Amino acid sequence: EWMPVTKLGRLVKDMKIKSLEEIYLFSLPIKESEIIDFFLGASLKDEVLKIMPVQKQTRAGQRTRFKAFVAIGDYNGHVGLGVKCSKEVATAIRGAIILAKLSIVPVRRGYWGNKIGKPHTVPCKVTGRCGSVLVRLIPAPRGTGIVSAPVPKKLLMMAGIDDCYTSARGCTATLGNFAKATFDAISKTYSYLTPDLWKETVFTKSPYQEFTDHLVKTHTRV
Amino acid sequence: MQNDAGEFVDLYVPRKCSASNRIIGAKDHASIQMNVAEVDKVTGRFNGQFKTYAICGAIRRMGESDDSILRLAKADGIVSKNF
Amino acid sequence: PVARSWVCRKTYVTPRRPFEKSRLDQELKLIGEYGLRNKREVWRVKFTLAKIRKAARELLTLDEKDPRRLFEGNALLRRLVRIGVLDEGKMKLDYILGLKIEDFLERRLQTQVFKLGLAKSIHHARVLIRQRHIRVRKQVVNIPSFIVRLDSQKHIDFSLRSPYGGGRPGRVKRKNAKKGQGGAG
Amino acid sequence: GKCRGLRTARKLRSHRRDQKWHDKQYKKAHLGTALKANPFGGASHAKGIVLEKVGVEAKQPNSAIRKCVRVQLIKNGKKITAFVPNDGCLNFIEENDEVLVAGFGRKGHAVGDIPGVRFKVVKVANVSLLALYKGKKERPR
RNA sequence: CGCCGGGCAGCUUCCGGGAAACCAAAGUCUUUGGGUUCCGGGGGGAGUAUGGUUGCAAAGCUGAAACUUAAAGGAAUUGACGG
RNA sequence: GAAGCAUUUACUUUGAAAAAAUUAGAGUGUUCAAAGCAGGCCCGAGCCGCCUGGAUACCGCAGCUAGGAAUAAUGGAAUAGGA
RNA sequence: AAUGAGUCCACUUUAAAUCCUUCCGCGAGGAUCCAUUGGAGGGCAAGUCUGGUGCCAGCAGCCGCGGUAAUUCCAGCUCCAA
Ligand SMILES: [Mg+2]
Ligand SMILES: [Mg+2]
Ligand SMILES: [Mg+2]
């Protein structure tokens, strides 16, 4: 049973803030995965991209640990990608799933042209870097599908992006870097500034001051 | 956002920095949002209202958050205009 | 030196990666659920759709009110409407870009014969066509990949010579009846 | 950096072909030394006559005797060494037979642990070697 | 004690970059175009053979191919070893 | 309207001319299709036959033509041998 | 129950034929009227099943497999791809 120790977890558990988008809006750090499976429960799917057997050398031979790459997300605009290393595989997969939940991010979608229905593709061309890997996402028309290698295909399908031309560069056989670069481009969708976002922002109350009376009565400490 | 029929197709509308006018992203944990209290003209007591400024993490890492907040406070009639 | 034509083309394209698990599963679902013979028929249908989509994309890049865009867009939309894969309300190239091969596979003669109640069990609908029991309006067709137009849709029927329309029962029933009446009075 | 001027097409093109001579594949295809050196002369197969049956020791760390034949080609009568692939297929080939010889897979490069052998036997005298191995046909005796 | 210009450098910095070591240039690069010269294309064979050319010579410049090979390398990490 | 352009070019847009076939593409149920260039409609029968097609695009550079004139090059009065 | 693939009378086709097309008569129950090429360690879909061999014979484009319990050779069985 979830007993939260965070102001954000206390507000989430008591149904004071709903719809994770304002947690994103005020850009707060999420430090409990229970928030993420509270809001996005029964829609998150997770899959293991890779288990790699990492090693370090000792005088009594090698010490072999296992690193797990888990990509998570509902298919409607959120992904995270977590990575954890452990002495045994099942622990690594569990920890990678928790870390993937914690690092979840919203995906901006746009139109290739003639903005008719639901948004289906990336809103512009974005590029993520990790190590030597450079992944470039390019807007594609409807019904194109995702034209990619299998790993960014998995990540982009979990993002809810239906149609995307891609391009890569570098040592893409370094699947950790290549997954991280795809995740980087996906997050800089909302990092990007577009003329329809030029309108001046209006500042609403942060959740920490909107429910400060609830937080002083119920969270600390009783 | 704003497909041709007219409705808004966006998860949310992110904040923009009040100094550099850049998007404050969902994983920018160096970016603050600070309210500055107002006082009434006659006795200087807090009257329950405030003005809000958001600074992105890049400005707040340059060291220019101080001067930016001071200029925004000049522009909004906070303290001096002649300081 | 000769009065031949030599003009021909392939009607399909193989996938780039063999042994992709998801692609293999999807086209096996299409084969089993529509009663096809091999992967080549799936590939032929998706090649047809890809060529249509290429034409539609190239027209969409052009300027509106360009005479070529108007002429070829109207012709393409009229063609897709007359074969029934696109509705009359959706008369723009964006809806052309929204099509899927499950829309084209539904318009085959085999699918129509099964869905008209004229034969159960789509595999029985294939062998019924290939044995010359079925006719579009008056023409006997044994081609499971015949693409049925909207106008020639109400006229799918058993042929007048098969032993499901008119008479003349087949050689098996005739043989059994004649050996029965040779064995009896 | 490179020159970007509007009237620099001659410099760009001349530099590109002068630098195209610096990759292995373009030079191999376009110099003619490789075409003259290889015994097939640009052909994909060749016919020859078996001179003797040899066994080549496999490269380390593998250890075996790879059964080959010494073949002298009918045209341009160079002498090559061709592999005889399968478990017993050397016993089909008798001395002074007339074989067909194909490449061995890597476009004039040695393959596997077999040192210096670039060719394999297909169709010892005209019955094919696969049909002989599988029992489909037999030597024309 | 300061200011300006041109120099040889130094410290510091989440400017940004880079595989990293590091670099205020090695930045302003998939958000890729200021001008221009020279030059690389897996490791060897080999800066060898041959022709030419310069030199008194020693040698310099220009410069292959056959053949061979599945790695050779860079930067960091953990150990082991260090007269 | 006869004549000429107060520079001449590049550039750009237009118009003529760039074989057919092939390619793109319109029409047409070869029984479907690859193809082909065909076909379609009434006969209660004089019907001593009617309708319709065999499009269109593209065709680098060089050459020809008519508008624009920003960009880029270029030219006119300095021993005035100037208008 | 249904049908061709064949066998085959006739028409049609054609300069004369043939083939297709049309149509008599025969023509399916292991419907024996018999689907094949490559594979099953990874890349790359599919077995640590069994017998044999024992750094041999062989496989292997490349990493590699084989020295008496071979997921890789030679076979049987069962699977995979077109
Ligand atoms: Mg430069
Ligand atoms: Mg080299
Ligand atoms: Mg086997």
Which helix (DSSP H) or strand (DSSP E) does residue C26 occupy?
Answer: helix C21-34
With beta carbons less than 8 A apart as the criterion, state whether A141 and A42 touch: no
Q: What is the DSSP letter of D96?
A: T
Residue contact A141–C99, C-beta within 8 A: no
CA dihedral (B59, B61, B62, B68) positive or negative: positive
Find where tokens 């094919």 sit.
Answer: D128
By C-alpha distance, which of A126, A120, A190 is closest to A157?
A120
D87 C-alpha to center of ligand 3: Å? 15
Residue contact B3–A114, C-beta within 8 A: no
Residue contact A143–C99, C-beta within 8 A: yes
The distance (Å) linking the CA of C67 with the C1' of F16 is 22
Backbone angles phi, psi at C83, to 5 degrees: -95, 0
Which amino acid, one-letter code, is at A104?
A: I
A116 touches chain C (CB under 8 A): yes
Residue contact B3–A200, C-beta within 8 A: no
By C-alpha distance, which of A28, A6, A8 is closest to B33?
A28
Whether nucleic acid strand F comes within 7 Å of the CB of C130, the answer is: no
The token duo for D133 is: 């191995």
Find where tokens 């309006």 sit.
Answer: C137
The token duo for C87 is: 């509705």
Residues C66-76: b if buried by 16+ CB within 10 A, e if exposed: eeebeebbeeb
The token duo for C115 is: 């869905």
Cis link prior to C163 (omega < 30° from 0)?
no
D119 C-alpha to center of ligand 3: Å? 27
**DSSP SS3 for B39:** strand
- Going by their DSSP bridges, the two strands A146-147 and A164-169 should be labelled as parallel
Residue contact B13–A197, C-beta within 8 A: yes
Q: How far is C40 from chain A (nearest CA, A)?
A: 21
Cis link prior to A221 (omega < 30° from 0)?
yes
The distance (Å) linking the CA of D64 with the C1' of E43 is 28
Instruction: For chain A, positions 180-209, list CB contacts with chain B under 8 A.
Output: 187-188, 190-193, 196-197, 200-201, 203, 206, 209
The token duo for A44 is: 């998150």
**DSSP SS3 for C112:** helix
Residues B16-30: b if buried by 16+ CB within 10 A, e if exposed: bbbbeebbbbbbbee
DSSP string of chain A, one letter each residue: -----SHHHHHHHTTSS-STHHHHHTTPPP--HHHHHHHSTTT-EEEEEEEEEEEEEETTEEEEEEEEEEEEE-TTTEEEEEEEEESSHHHHHHHHHHHHHHT-EE---B-SSS--SS--B-SS-EEEEETTEEEEEEE--TT--EES-HHHHHHHHHHT---EEEEEES-TT-HHHHHHHHHHHHHHHHHS--GGG-SPP--PPPHHHHTHHHIIIIIS--
Strand partners, A48: A70
- Polymer length of chain C: 185
- Going by their DSSP bridges, the two strands A164-169 and A133-139 should be labelled as antiparallel
- Going by their DSSP bridges, the two strands A78-86 and A61-73 should be labelled as antiparallel
Q: How far apart are CA D92 and CA D123, in angstroms?
A: 10
CA dihedral (D135, D137, D140, D141) positive or negative: positive
**DSSP SS3 for C66:** coil
The token duo for A218 is: 């119920």
Q: Which method was it determined by?
A: cryo-EM
The token duo for A93 is: 């997969």
Q: State how far the alpha carbon of A45 is from the alpha carbons of A27, A158, B59, in Å.
A: 24, 8, 37
Resolution value in angstroms: 2.9
Q: Which chain B residues have any C-beta within 8 angstroms of a chain A C-beta?
A: 1-4, 9-16, 22-29, 31, 33, 35, 52, 54
Which residues, other chains included, contact B73 with Cβ-Cβ below 8 Å and sequence gap of 6+?
Answer: B36, B79
A168 C-alpha to center of ligand 2: Å? 26
With beta carbons less than 8 A apart as the criterion, state whether A64 and A166 touch: no
Which amino acid, one-letter code, is at A112?
A: W
Candidates A106, A191, A192; nearest CB to B11:
A106
Which residues, other chains included, contact C160 with Cβ-Cβ below 8 Å and sequence gap of 6+?
Answer: C135, C166
Q: How far is B54 from chain A (nearest CA, A)?
A: 9
Whether nucleic acid strand F comes within 7 Å of the CB of C60, the answer is: no
Which amino acid, one-letter code, is at A217?
A: K
Q: How far apart are CA A71 and CA A65, in angstroms?
A: 20
Q: Which residue of A has its CA nearest to C56?
A: A141
CA dihedral (A179, A185, A190, A191) positive or negative: positive
D129 C-alpha to center of ligand 3: Å? 21
Which helix (DSSP H) or strand (DSSP E) does residue D99 occupy?
Answer: strand D98-103
Residue contact C98–A141, C-beta within 8 A: no
- Measured between beta carbons, the chain C residues lying within 8 angstroms of A116 are 94
Q: How far apart are CA A35 and CA A2, in angstroms?
A: 10
D21 C-alpha to center of ligand 2: Å? 12
